[PDB]
Amino acid sequence: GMTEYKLVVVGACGVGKSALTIQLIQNHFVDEYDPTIEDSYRKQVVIDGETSLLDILDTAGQEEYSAMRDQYMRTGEGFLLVFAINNTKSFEDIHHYREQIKRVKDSEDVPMVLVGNKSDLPSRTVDTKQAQDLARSYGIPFIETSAKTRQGVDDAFYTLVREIRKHKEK
Numbered sequence: 001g002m003t004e005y006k007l008v009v010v011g012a013c014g015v016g017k018s019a020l021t022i023q024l025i026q027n028h029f030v031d032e033y034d035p036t037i038e039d040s041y042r043k044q045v046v047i048d049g050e051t052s053l054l055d056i057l058d059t060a061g062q063e064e065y066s067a068m069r070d071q072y073m074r075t076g077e078g079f080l081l082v083f084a085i086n087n088t089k090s091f092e093d094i095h096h097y098r099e100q101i102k103r104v105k106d107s108e109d110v111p112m113v114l115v116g117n118k119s120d121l122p123s124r125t126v127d128t129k130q131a132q133d134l135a136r137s138y139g140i141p142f143i144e145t146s147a148k149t150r151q152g153v154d155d156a157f158y159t160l161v162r163e164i165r166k167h168k169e170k
């Protein structure tokens with residue numbers, strides 16, 4: 001079959017994981033998406049001339065560490081680490097999401113992209129430089145997005161695919 005990429009969107013409640021996912025899948029902004037709905041969406045795309053199937057898991061529900069979740073998360077090939085630029089705690093939480101990915105993958109080299117969402121909002125509390133420095137320390141890209149306007153959304157997911165390709169070449 002055609003190439004597939006298993007992508008996982010992670011980050012604290014309310015950062016815009018679901019809004020980002022629906023923007024990628026359906027090309028419009030959803031104001032309300034139930035925080036208890038965790039689901040995956042597949043979409044056929046062409047990136048750098050390669051046709052692939054993106055299988056995107058939008059994580060949700062509760063903070064719990066079920067066996068299903070670990071196994072589930074283990075199958076992820078790349079991860080979007082999403083915070084919101086107006087929520088400092090969500091940015092501080094990124095360390096947790098990175099470590100948990102590192103724990104379940106048993107690897108220091110997992111495709112990830114740091115995503116600073118809600119870039120449309122004026123009430124910024126997390127400096128772009130701060131995010132850039134963190135991303136550089138992790139050795140990963142940083143992309144600013146707005147699920148509201150769709151700024152950076154394709155770039156975020158497509159950049160993650162490119163990171164997966166880089167990983168697969170090694």
Ligand SMILES: *CCC(=O)N1CCN(c2ncnc3c(F)c(-c4ccccc4C(F)(F)F)c(Cl)cc23)CC1
Nearest residue numbers: 010012013035059060061062063073097100101104
């Ligand atoms: C508001 C609902 C929502 O969007 N979610 C609820 C909280 N939930 C969550 N919270 C805290 N830690 C999480 C976590 F560590 C994982 C996880 C588990 C196992 C391996 C990796 C990961 C990680 F996401 F990469 F961090 C998950 Cl799946 C969810 C966690 C998710 C968001």
Ligand SMILES: Nc1nc2c(ncn2[C@@H]2O[C@H](COP(=O)(O)OP(=O)(O)O)[C@@H](O)[C@H]2O)c(=O)[nH]1
Nearest residue numbers: 013014015016017018019030031118146147148
């Ligand atoms: N202004 C703005 N609001 C957003 C953006 N992304 C998500 N939201 C809103 O923030 C809230 C949480 O979004 P949601 O997608 O449910 O976040 P999740 O809990 O990480 O899945 C919702 O009310 C969304 O409408 C964005 O880029 N800009």
Ligand SMILES: [Mg+2]
Nearest residue numbers: 017018035060
């Ligand atoms: Mg959600």
